């Protein structure tokens, strides 16, 4: 992270599409270095549905400039997440803050 910033880091990080953001709130059912499985809250669940979200992270893929694109989980097992939170850090990102 930048020790001296301007507060525009989070907007650029989230609004870029390189970080996995939770579609719905809930509790982290299963966290792994390659996938995340969220157990959605009861009130946000649609009827006739097992409420779980599966997020597959991209690991060591090639970019247009022959660089590395790699996402890392940044949440623990069995902890709450709300709609809009960041689950994984993309390239040049630290806890949802842009970090070049």
């Amino acid at each position: 992270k930048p020790l001296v910033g301007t507060g525009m880091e989070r907007a650029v990080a989230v609004d870029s599409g390189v970080t996995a953001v939770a579609k719905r709130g809930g509790v982290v059912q299963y966290v792994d270095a390659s996938r995340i499985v969220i157990k959605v809250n009861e009130d946000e669940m649609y009827p006739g549905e097992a409420g779980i979200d599966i997020y597959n992270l991209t690991k060591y893929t090639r970019s247009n400039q022959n660089t590395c694109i790699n996402q890392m989980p940044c949440v623990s097992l069995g902890e709450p997440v709300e709609r809009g939170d960041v689950l994984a850090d993309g390239p040049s990102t630290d806890l949802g803050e842009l970090a070049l």
Partner: peptide, 11 residues
């Protein structure tokens, strides 16, 4: 070293 193991949270 550029891979991940199932059940381990760290690369």
């Amino acid at each position: 070293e550029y891979s991940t193991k199932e059940g381990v949270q760290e690369d």
